Amino acid sequence: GAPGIILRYLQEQNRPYSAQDVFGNLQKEHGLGKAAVVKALDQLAQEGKIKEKTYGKQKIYFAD
User: Which Gene Ontology BP terms does the record give?
Assistant: First the structure.
């Protein structure tokens, strides 16, 4: 349920976080895998739960 954890996280924070930000922050709190977080981020964006923007070579996600 990484998508649920990440979505809730983004909504509660109300702030944009990078793929690395979300993973790193939820790594110690929940123990989500790197691939799990990244795929869950794309899963949420595909479902239309969150939005995404590409900044250089990195990606940043936020709830909306």
Answer: homologous chromosome pairing at meiosis; reciprocal meiotic recombination
Taken in order of first residue, the domains within the chain and their CATH numbers are 1-64 (1.10.10.10)
The DSSP string of 1-43 is -HHHHHHHHHHHHTS-EEHHHHHHHHHTTT---HHHHHHHHHH
The residue written with tokens 């990484």 in the block is 2
This structure was determined by NMR
Cα separations in angstroms, 55 against 16, 19, 35, 60? 12, 11, 19, 7
List all residues 6 or more positions away from 61 whose beta carbon is below 8 Å from its beta carbon: 6, 10, 16, 17, 18, 19, 22, 41, 44, 45, 50, 51, 52
